Symmetry: C3
């Protein structure tokens, strides 16, 4: 909540609207390595976070920290290239700030992507996990983008999250993967947000396994929470860039340079998939 | 700890004492929907949080955010109507601030109430759960009202919480329910504080089940911790206003308007019960 | 991260270096009750945290809050007597600050010690637990000393922790215990950091058991994370000063005055052990 106020989201929404011919319907937050999706846009208009009025600017990236509009598979999009994370210092009400403006920009659906670790044994690095649920660890402790006075203008005080990932789109997703007649079926599991920038220890990965998590990451959850709070259809995927959970001879135990999950390769796939998916996102035209 | 200092709790305690004929023995924090208990008071004196010197004022409520004194079943009380929550922005050392003044006001027992979600399957919405234990999730991460320099004037650095809910009063509680010859027996389980304002997801509810929790809420724990820190007899109940933990067809999955647990109905019951309970709280007169 | 900057760690490192003839190789953070190890030092030079430029000063202790150099078993040491904890108010980037200067002082190995609770049933108060892994609970929520912009000068953005406690030294540790031909074998388990100053409840201890933890404490984890981030060999022990996990008649349920684990007795033992251990820490001379 804090730091920003409604006119803050209202001045930014307007600044963008009055600076772009585009009026986005779908907002797409690309995860690490998935920024490529921006290339798929047409009639694109690239704004620098830096440029936009109250938009948090990047801590290091910047370049791989831009907001591009345009179109994807027949949907007026707006892809945030280079999402913000709590571990960069951004308070969660800066992390999720974009989502609040996308809503005022008219966005009604938010597709978020990310790069997690593979907790579930069945996963194979490279797999794309459809997020069916999430475990908001920072939220349990207090780190929830909604903390602070509730702005009924955006939504409720106690919004529910048991319905976060829109059954419909998840269906249309599982179907679509099948339409394409793909190899490894679109995975589906719970994503566990873990704040910290360092990577989990074996002992930690195991508690994440026990907790129910399928993939671990340091983002998404914040954007999903406030998006839902605004009443935004939300669905997303998680590129499984690696995996671990074994003391009994770590062997590899990751590093990060390991995270790439056949970089170009898989990143390209999750991207095309999301793009194909634009056609399964209800058009504000009601369609009938 | 932070923000306030001893004279802060000392000026407020005195301001109240020198503004009320009353000298409370029991302090009662009413949960959402349980504010009605204030009606049961006699010779009551309603102060507005706003009015009291260093007392955190409400973020939105205010009205359903008052401090009323008076008497309940032969006990000099002081009921905080409209408790503060971490999710409203209040730092935990503002949430629990009242408890620290109640102690300086002479309060020796603190009965807290709340409205949780029903994790334990045996629970039936409407049930009243006697809190036998708690799992302080925000505490594990750092969100503990005691964090900061310890004020030995109030208590220890490392107070123990394994004894928080006073065996005695829990006994007298289970007995009392039986005296009244009630229907569903006074439930008894562990309350898990979860900070965030949004509601838990199915995936989250399950980790709360696995963790051992019986009911989920966003308060109480902070007040119980510092109350105990002062050396205050503490016991409390949790009105089960709902329940969930099922992906396999959510069906209802809550909302909040669902939370009421037969509002007037059950809220009234937990209230009378607490009031009857005043008679089972040791009188400072030692009684003998 | 925050608050300090590189010249901050650079001015302090230099201030110390230009104020001590010593150039530490090993940095030893002593836990509560283990400050005695300082006595084992020779040619020792005691600086007051207070004295050192940007060094966080103690909240209460101070005296039992000093930085002593000198030598231990043929290793140029620097023992921080009286470590900082998150529960004293110190932001984690003050807690771990010393580690960042020890690195600039040339320290290459960090041996941390602490006093936990005994979660694992096999443990007997007095036991010394070799830390083989850790569960960073405050980290999951956001409380990670690395949060904020990454300083590539010190290390990576996403350092891994699956390798934190250096296999080698753990081996040399288990062996050494055996060399000495001791009684109860050097225990080995996962340490779970829990922030809060109050002690865990029975309900909490059980989730710590389920999570996988073997011993609970309120420190170490922060120092281990940034030490590893700098690329510092890290290993440590945990003096088991007590234990609990039982509603079914608490009986003792601790207090803190119980924590001592045969104070002088066991504290002395873990100390001599660490000192003997100086001989198993690779000398920067490469040794060959
Ligand atoms: N937390 C987390 N853990 C892993 O193992 C990851 N791999 N890629 N992103 C990751 N994030
Ligand atoms: N956390 C939480 N969860 C539920 O399901 C609740 N119902 N009423 N208060 C509640 N608080
Ligand atoms: N958290 C924690 N718990 C116990 O039981 C302890 N005993 N000594 N330090 C301790 N720290």
């Amino acid at each position: 909540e804090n730091g920003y106020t409604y006119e803050d989201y209202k001045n930014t929404a307007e600044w963008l609207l009055s600076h772009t011919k585009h009026r986005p319907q779908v907002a797409i937050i690309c995860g690490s390595g998935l920024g490529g999706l921006t290339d798929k846009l047409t009639q694109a208009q690239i704004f620098d976070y830096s440029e936009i009025p109250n938009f948090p600017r990047s801590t290091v990236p910047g370049h791989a920290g831009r907001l591009v509009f345009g179109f994807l598979n027949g949907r007026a999009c707006v892809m945030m290239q280079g999402r913000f994370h709590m571990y960069e210092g951004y308070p969660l009400w800066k992390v999720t700030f974009p989502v609040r403006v996308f809503h005022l920009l008219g966005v009604d659906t938010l597709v978020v992507t990310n790069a997690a670790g593979g907790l579930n044994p069945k996963f194979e690095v490279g797999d794309i996990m459809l997020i069916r649920d999430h475990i908001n660890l920072p939220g349990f402790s207090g780190q929830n983008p909604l903390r602070g006075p509730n702005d009924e203008r955006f939504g409720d005080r106690f919004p529910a999250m048991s319905d976060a990932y829109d059954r419909t789109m998840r269906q249309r997703a599982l179907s679509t993967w099948k339409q394409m007649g793909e190899q490894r079926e679109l995975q589906e599991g719970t994503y566990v947000m873990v704040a910290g920038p360092s990577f989990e220890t074996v002992a930690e990965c195991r508690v994440l396994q026990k907790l129910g998590a399928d993939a671990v990451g340091m983002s998404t959850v914040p954007e999903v929470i406030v998006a839902r709070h605004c009443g935004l259809r939300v669905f997303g995927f998680s590129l499984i860039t690696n995996k671990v959970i074994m003391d009994y001879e770590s062997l590899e135990k990751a590093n990060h340079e390991e995270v790439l999950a056949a970089g170009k390769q898989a990143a390209q796939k999750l991207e095309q998939f999301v793009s194909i998916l634009m056609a399964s996102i209800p058009l504000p035209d009601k369609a009938s």
